Amino acid sequence: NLYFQGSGRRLVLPVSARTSGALRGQAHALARRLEERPGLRLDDVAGALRADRPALRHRLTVSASSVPEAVEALRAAVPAVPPVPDEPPKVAFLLPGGGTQYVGMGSGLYRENDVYRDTVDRCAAVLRPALGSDLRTALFEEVEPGSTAAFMALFVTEYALARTLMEEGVRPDALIGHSLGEYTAACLAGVMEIDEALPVVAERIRLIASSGGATVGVAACADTVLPLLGEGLSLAAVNSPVACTVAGDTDAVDRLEAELTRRGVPFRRLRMPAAAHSHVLDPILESFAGHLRTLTLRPPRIPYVTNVTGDWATDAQATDVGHWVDHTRRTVRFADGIAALWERERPVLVEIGPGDSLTKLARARLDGEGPVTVTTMRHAKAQAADGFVLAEALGRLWSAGVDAALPH
Ligand SMILES: *C(=O)[C@@H](Cc1ccccc1)C(=O)O
User: Fold this and answer.
1) Angle value at C-alpha 112, between 109 and 113, nearest 5 degrees
2) Going by CA atoms, what residue is nearest to atom 6 of ligand 1?
3) Nearest to 268 by CA among 252, 278, 253, 281
4) Domain check: are 368 and 282 in the same one?
5) Ligand 1 pocket check: which of 205, 206, 280, 292 to mutate, most ligand atoms within 8 Å of Cβ?
6) Both 23 and 167 in a single domain?
7) How many other C-beta atoms can be found within 10 angstroms of the C-beta atom of residue 247?
8) Would you say the CB of residue 308 lies under 6 angstroms from ligand 1?
9) Domain range for residue 229?
10) From the CA of 342, how far away is ligand 1's center (Å)?
């Protein structure tokens, strides 16, 4: 059953106080009021909490589908974000690359949220010629791991999730993508049109996937890893002080893993037998440029940092075919890019996509500047409903000072 059900009963209850402090206090008060009043409907308490109390500096929220569920959450409630700053905070979207896609992702939002449903539906129809199948099959029923559809499923999930949040009035002041997430960022930023981008991203993935090679993620500083490379190897990404990835010919990768083992450096072979962001891709760069030439590229209407330089993208870069070729061939400078994003805006960091991979990289790179981070979709494995994870994200965004995030 993926028939539309609409919104369910799940609501977000906001609580604000003036002290760290009184916040805990009122959250218990509200719980005591709720169990001691069987007249009260979640319905009305949610409304009253918005209209009949000011939005103060110290905030928390709970999510609930019924009053006993809310009572228990309000008991356990502990403030999770710092008090709202005096100016409303900036919001950044972090768009993951491949590696956390799974069959079933967002199926709860597809059944509950009509913007999410329409965006997926629209992307599936656009993509049917390039893909050769209905994307919703890969999204919700079955997919070949590492296939073109599996990667397009992640792209559309990211885009549908971003549009859903913006429909709530959470619009990003800045964007950063990792690898494939940079295309999602470009579409959200106005650099590309999602309709033209869908088939081009699809053919991009085929051209990369069929170039062979291998990719190893290494849990170490890039400075530690650099001396061990290596003919036949490229530094594929620099992600955080304890994360980088190396790609190249399979034999060169095998050797690197042997020398990494001998020095006690932890690593993991990535599933995908591809070698994105490495010399292995040279034979297909010009053909891929041919596909890039069919896009209408425009300067970004929302600023974003590119992985190419680890800095804000210039209008000349965003609109240059050769820069996008570089984005595919060159190191993903995410750790730098996340520092550039932080220095300017100091924004709330909202991961748009399944899991928390960029959130962990941000925490490692931005230690100990204290970023507030928000996560938006569960790991494959997690037992929470998609609608709950999203209601929590929005409550948390409101608690941090993004007032428009609170629904209704
Ligand atoms: C990064 O996200 C990377 C993902 C990918 C796609 C196809 C084959 C290997 C790796 C990318 O899109 O450049």
Assistant:
1) 75
2) 205
3) 253
4) yes
5) 205
6) no
7) 28
8) no
9) 212-274
10) 25
Same domain, 154 and 245: no
Q: Ligand 1 pocket, 358 CB below 6 A?
A: no
- In the reported structure, the alpha carbon of residue 184 is separated from the centroid of ligand 1 by a whole-number distance in angstroms of 13
Q: Look up the CATH number of the domain holding residue 270.
A: 3.30.70.250
Same domain, 203 and 328: yes
Q: What are the backbone dihedrals phi and psi of residue 54, each rounded to the nearest 5 degrees, phi first?
A: -75, 155
- Please give the tally of structural domains in the chain: 3
Residues 6+ apart with CB under 8 A from 185: 93, 95, 175, 176, 177, 304
Question: If you measure from the C-alpha of residue 205 to the centroid of ligand 1, how many angstroms do you get, rounded to a whole number?
Answer: 7
Instruction: Tell me the β-bridge partners of 305.
Output: 176, 312
For 41, the token pair is 């409907």
**181 residue type, one letter:** G
Atom of ligand 1 nearest to the CA of 275: 9
Residue with CA closest to ligand 1 atom 8: 209
Q: Do 218 and 358 have their domain in common?
A: no
My answer on whether 387 and 305 are in the same domain is: no
Kindly state whether residues 207 and 231 are assigned to the same domain: no
Please, are residues 158 and 103 in contact by the beta-carbon 8 Å criterion? Answer: no
Of the candidates 164, 134, 143, the residue with the CA atom closest to the CA atom of residue 101:
143
Q: Is the CB of 172 inside a 6 Å radius of any atom of ligand 1? A: no
In angstroms, what is the span from residue 151 Cα to ligand 1's centroid?
8
Best substitution site from 147, 182, 250, 272 to test ligand 1's pocket, by max atoms within 8 Å of Cβ?
A: 272
- Inter-residue contact 66 to 23 (CB < 8 Å): no
Phi, psi for 190 (deg, rounded to 5): 90, -5
